[PDB]
Scaffold this active site. Structure first.
Site, PDB file in Angstrom:
ATOM      1  N   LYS A   1       5.544   2.526   3.771  1.00 44.92           N
ATOM      2  CA  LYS A   1       6.950   2.852   3.537  1.00 44.92           C
ATOM      3  C   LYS A   1       7.331   4.287   3.882  1.00 44.92           C
ATOM      4  CE  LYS A   1       8.646  -0.397   0.158  1.00 44.92           C
ATOM      5  NZ  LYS A   1       7.585  -1.424   0.007  1.00 44.92           N
TER       6      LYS A   1
ATOM      7  N   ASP B   1      -3.437  -1.622  -1.635  1.00 49.58           N
ATOM      8  CA  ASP B   1      -2.185  -1.660  -0.936  1.00 49.58           C
ATOM      9  C   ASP B   1      -1.429  -0.410  -1.377  1.00 49.58           C
ATOM     10  OD1 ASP B   1       0.401  -2.054  -0.134  1.00 49.58           O
ATOM     11  OD2 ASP B   1       0.499  -4.176  -0.693  1.00 49.58           O
TER      12      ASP B   1
ATOM     13  N   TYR C   1       2.964  -6.962  -5.903  1.00 44.76           N
ATOM     14  CA  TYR C   1       3.774  -7.314  -4.742  1.00 44.76           C
ATOM     15  C   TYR C   1       3.070  -6.779  -3.515  1.00 44.76           C
ATOM     16  CZ  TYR C   1       7.564  -7.570  -1.348  1.00 44.76           C
ATOM     17  OH  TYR C   1       8.322  -7.876  -0.241  1.00 44.76           O
TER      18      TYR C   1
ATOM     19  N   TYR D   1      16.575 -10.786   0.390  1.00 45.48           N
ATOM     20  CA  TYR D   1      16.659 -11.737  -0.735  1.00 45.48           C
ATOM     21  C   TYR D   1      18.101 -12.109  -1.109  1.00 45.48           C
ATOM     22  CZ  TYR D   1      11.679 -11.504  -1.275  1.00 45.48           C
ATOM     23  OH  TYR D   1      10.335 -11.626  -1.068  1.00 45.48           O
TER      24      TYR D   1
HETATM   25  C1  LIG Z   1      14.948  -2.947   2.000  1.00 47.12           C
HETATM   26  C2  LIG Z   1      15.594  -3.223   0.641  1.00 47.12           C
HETATM   27  O1  LIG Z   1      16.604  -2.604   0.326  1.00 47.12           O
HETATM   28  C3  LIG Z   1      15.003  -4.180  -0.209  1.00 47.12           C
HETATM   29  C4  LIG Z   1      15.599  -4.465  -1.447  1.00 47.12           C
HETATM   30  C5  LIG Z   1      15.054  -5.400  -2.324  1.00 47.12           C
HETATM   31  C6  LIG Z   1      13.878  -6.080  -1.984  1.00 47.12           C
HETATM   32  N1  LIG Z   1      13.335  -6.992  -2.831  1.00 47.12           N
HETATM   33  C7  LIG Z   1      14.054  -7.465  -4.059  1.00 47.12           C
HETATM   34  C8  LIG Z   1      13.139  -7.375  -5.291  1.00 47.12           C
HETATM   35  N2  LIG Z   1      11.828  -8.006  -4.970  1.00 47.12           N
HETATM   36  C9  LIG Z   1      11.379  -9.005  -5.755  1.00 47.12           C
HETATM   37  O2  LIG Z   1      12.023  -9.383  -6.730  1.00 47.12           O
HETATM   38  C10 LIG Z   1      10.183  -9.675  -5.475  1.00 47.12           C
HETATM   39  C11 LIG Z   1      10.160 -10.590  -4.421  1.00 47.12           C
HETATM   40  C12 LIG Z   1       8.993 -11.288  -4.123  1.00 47.12           C
HETATM   41  C13 LIG Z   1       7.846 -11.070  -4.893  1.00 47.12           C
HETATM   42  C14 LIG Z   1       7.872 -10.165  -5.952  1.00 47.12           C
HETATM   43 CL1  LIG Z   1       6.446  -9.916  -6.895  1.00 47.12          CL
HETATM   44  C15 LIG Z   1       9.042  -9.466  -6.254  1.00 47.12           C
HETATM   45  C16 LIG Z   1      11.088  -7.495  -3.780  1.00 47.12           C
HETATM   46  C17 LIG Z   1      11.971  -7.533  -2.538  1.00 47.12           C
HETATM   47  C18 LIG Z   1      13.275  -5.803  -0.748  1.00 47.12           C
HETATM   48  C19 LIG Z   1      13.826  -4.862   0.129  1.00 47.12           C
HETATM   49  C1  LIG Z   2       7.300  -3.281   0.417  1.00 48.72           C
HETATM   50  C2  LIG Z   2       5.830  -3.456   0.179  1.00 48.72           C
HETATM   51  C3  LIG Z   2       5.054  -4.265   1.135  1.00 48.72           C
HETATM   52  C4  LIG Z   2       5.743  -4.916   2.323  1.00 48.72           C
HETATM   53  O1  LIG Z   2       6.325  -3.951   3.203  1.00 48.72           O
HETATM   54  P1  LIG Z   2       7.433  -4.379   4.316  1.00 48.72           P
HETATM   55  O2  LIG Z   2       7.481  -3.178   5.216  1.00 48.72           O
HETATM   56  O3  LIG Z   2       8.690  -4.645   3.523  1.00 48.72           O
HETATM   57  O4  LIG Z   2       6.902  -5.622   4.968  1.00 48.72           O
HETATM   58  C5  LIG Z   2       3.703  -4.429   0.887  1.00 48.72           C
HETATM   59  N1  LIG Z   2       3.075  -3.880  -0.174  1.00 48.72           N
HETATM   60  C6  LIG Z   2       3.681  -3.121  -1.120  1.00 48.72           C
HETATM   61  C7  LIG Z   2       2.922  -2.535  -2.286  1.00 48.72           C
HETATM   62  C8  LIG Z   2       5.126  -2.863  -0.996  1.00 48.72           C
HETATM   63  O5  LIG Z   2       5.755  -2.105  -1.935  1.00 48.72           O
END
Ligand SMILES: CC(=O)c1ccc(N2CCN(C(=O)c3cccc(Cl)c3)CC2)cc1
Ligand SMILES: *Cc1c(COP(=O)(O)O)cnc(C)c1O
Ligand SMILES: CC(=O)c1ccc(N2CCN(C(=O)c3cccc(Cl)c3)CC2)cc1
Ligand SMILES: *Cc1c(COP(=O)(O)O)cnc(C)c1O
Lengths: 429, 429
Positions: free
Chosen positions: A277, A248, A151, A19
């Site tokens: 995860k 999930d 999410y 992001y």
């Molecule tokens: C791998 C890692 O360090 C990581 C850090 C932040 C990540 N984000 C930033 C916060 N996020 C959101 O704000 C978010 C992004 C899309 C949908 C929803 Cl509901 C929440 C989820 C993904 C994902 C992965």
């Molecule tokens: C992070 C997350 C996913 C997506 O997993 P990725 O390995 O980043 O694709 C799906 N569902 C939930 C509840 C999560 O926290």
């Protein structure tokens, strides 16, 4: 070979982050040079410093980094077989892992589809649900329902059931599938909420393949907790209205909420479940989607005759080998006591934040602690504030939170909670 | 577990790629080891050594348990298994990004790591959509491709797979409706490119991108096309302001006789995906690259960032083995190696042209295809190839191989001989 300075220069020019932008990052990422147990070695002022991975590196590092049993599992497997295609072949790591996963998940989840990430496992879950109803002669049941605040990942179908605000749905006008959203599930149990959820589901039942939710804890959509009884209601609603239930558990699985899987708090089984995860103890990308015999047999007996999905690295021996070791390591100890102690440590450590002027809520659930603030947390301020305190923390929006490794001692939890409390203090200050 | 116990667990609990549960025509064969070009499989209770002619689904370009790659994994494992890529960066990611930027077609300056090819394709589409939204043209949201393609199994990825091969009939009303040009022919025909342009012209204002596999189409039918088509696509995309995306997840890393298949045309796409052979077949990893202009436009748009971030993004272990695999490839005369391999495939497969059930024999780099006149029965083909000491997995009417680059001339001839024998059996009934 690259120095931290060279790493930063390459990174700034060439690397995307989660992001993030290219060339418009408010702050450079921090160079990580090692990880061992609960600790990361990061470069700060050109020098290596050890800090607590309070985030478990985004929920993954439940046994900490470089656990000797897990390192050993990987290296032993490496000497025998790195990978073979799962098309037409099977192997011990896959069989061992699948047996373990079927045994330990909520009753009834009898089959396991391995993939390489949570978002993919979610798409697999949706695919299972859609193929299930197509296998029942009801292709109209193709929409998903969820409650807000959720999410489920970043692939385009996963995006469609993410919270509309968190997921920036307004930037995706006309591209995402239009799904059914119930209001945000409350923390406290109110049967009126379940009654309304049921009434809303009832009017869409004929077009709904599944309800998809994170059980008990909603992660990336806001670190919100809800009464487990809501899941009991969802099971009942889904049973009565013939809509599949998908949990999930990609963030909640493997002990994180104080039960082996968060579904266990409600004593309910979903029809389909995703895990990811923490599955490999944070070594390697791997996820799994499980489903009941009924789901598997219905898909397999339908017009298609197969689940139409098959990742290149499906059931990778290395990832599966380390996962087996990771799950066995969890099950071979008194993990339940361990998480109770962690929860108690988080509760005790975060209690003083309640009194802070900018703090609206403090909540703990298993090895998860959250401080919710009345305003957005300045990351350019917060990140160095926790680092200066020997803790790697990643706040977002108005939330300062931790999901620490299970191997964290009481001293380490104190250290984590202290940094969190202090970040919250600076929010108000 | 014994081979028998593995089979029992597998049959009850494990999904395979594009498979059923409980309705499999054949049990998978138990794999117990893999070393170099060779797999150890259990056949009638006895271990046997067979050539991995499929490179374990395109992955094992250097063979299995290559000392350099094994070593790269264990030495990364010693220091850092994984850290979260949100806010942190690391040497394996920077080294790999640098390498990838410097060996991919010119202008591909930024790198987004993910865990699988399907995800990297979804990332590519997201880049394209966000790009146009950053240009105030949100109407540009559809994708165009030619038929015969494969781009993965997630729902967006599915929408640009060949509608026939991808069974889009099964997905009526669920998949995004994309624009499909007819199958790209083998030989260069200016009329095809003219028609492609004419069709694109009608949708230009609603198209974000053209997405194709360059030169070789893999899972959609192992078809090759003249690289000149890629020069046309580039020109068409330029004139009509549609982004060009190359999916090199199967074609990357020398497989077609050039380092990347785009190189056969000297063409640079705006966005590029890589994956299967990226780690030398050890671990799941993929990457999506885009130009500076795409990156800047996304970063300057309303989101201010690319709205994607996988949990295991840029996994150190996977990145480290990938660095070693890429360096191993670049540090040898890979071009002569692949040329010799292709010559061996060509010489070895020639006799198949005369077989009654064979419609075509084609070779492109380290890819050999016998196209048959009927679907190949795996129940006959699999054991027949194993009888000849080779692991082959035909699909549809195709008996094909994409062998490890380390296969000796004798091993290539052993592989092609088994292929010939399978093709003979197909027409033998
Ligand atoms: C791998 C890692 O360090 C990581 C850090 C932040 C990540 N984000 C930033 C916060 N996020 C959101 O704000 C978010 C992004 C899309 C949908 C929803 Cl509901 C929440 C989820 C993904 C994902 C992965
Ligand atoms: C992070 C997350 C996913 C997506 O997993 P990725 O390995 O980043 O694709 C799906 N569902 C939930 C509840 C999560 O926290
Ligand atoms: C990992 C492995 O052994 C494997 C084997 C076969 C796999 N497939 C996927 C693509 N296949 C298709 O038939 C296909 C599936 C969807 C779209 C298109 Cl165009 C083709 C053949 C079976 C995938 C993985
Ligand atoms: C295999 C493949 C993909 C999908 O990769 P996974 O790692 O299986 O998700 C995408 N595109 C092409 C061209 C492929 O060959």
């Amino acid at each position: 070979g690259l120095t931290p300075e060279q790493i930063i220069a390459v990174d700034g020019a060439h690397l995307w982050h989660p992001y993030s932008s290219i060339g418009r990052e408010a702050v450079s990422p921090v160079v990580a040079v090692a990880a061992h147990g609960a600790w990361l070695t990061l470069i700060r002022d050109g020098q290596p410093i050890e800090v607590l991975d309070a985030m478990s590196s985004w929920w993954t590092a439940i046994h900490g980094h470089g656990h000797p049993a897990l390192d050993q599992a990987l290296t032993t497997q490496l000497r025998v077989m790195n990978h073979v295609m799962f098309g037409g072949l099977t192997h011990e790591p896959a069989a061992r892992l699948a047996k373990l996963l079927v045994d330990i998940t909520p009753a009834g989840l009898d089959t396991v589809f391995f993939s390489d990430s949570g978002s993919v496992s979610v798409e697999v879950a949706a695919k299972m649900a859609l193929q299930y109803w197509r296998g029942r002669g009801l292709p109209g049941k193709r929409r998903l329902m969820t409650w807000r605040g959720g999410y489920h990942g970043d692939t385009f179908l996963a995006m469609s059931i993410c919270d509309p605000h968190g997921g920036m749905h307004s930037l995706w006008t006309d591209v995402l599938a239009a799904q059914v959203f119930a209001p945000q599930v409350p923390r406290d149990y109110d049967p009126a909420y379940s009654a309304a959820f049921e009434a809303q589901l009832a009017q869409h039942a004929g077009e709904l393949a599944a309800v998809v939710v994170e059980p008990v804890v909603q992660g990336a959509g806001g670190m919100r907790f809800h009464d487990p009884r809501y899941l009991h209601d969802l099971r009942d609603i889904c049973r009565r209205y013939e809509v599949l239930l998908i949990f999930d558990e990609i963030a909640t699985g493997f002990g994180r909420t104080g039960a082996l899987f968060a579904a266990d708090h409600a004593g309910v089984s979903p029809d389909i479940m995703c895990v990811g995860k923490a599955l490999t103890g944070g070594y390697l990308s791997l996820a799994a989607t499980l489903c009941t015999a009924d789901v598997a047999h219905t898909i397999s007996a339908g017009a298609a005759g197969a689940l139409m999905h098959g990742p290149t690295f499906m059931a990778n021996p290395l990832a599966c080998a380390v996962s087996v070791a990771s799950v066995e390591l969890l099950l071979g100890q008194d993990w339940r006591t361990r998480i109770t102690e962690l929860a108690a440590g988080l509760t005790a450590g975060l209690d003083t934040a309640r009194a802070l002027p900018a703090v609206t809520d403090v909540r703990v659930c298993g090895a998860i602690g959250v401080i919710e603030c009345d305003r957005p947390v300045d990351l350019a301020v917060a990140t160095p504030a926790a680092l200066d305190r020997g803790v790697w923390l990643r706040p977002f929006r108005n939330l300062v939170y931790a999901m620490p490794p299970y191997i964290c001692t009481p001293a380490e939890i104190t250290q984590i909670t202290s940094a969190m409390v202090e970040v919250a203090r600076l929010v108000g200050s």
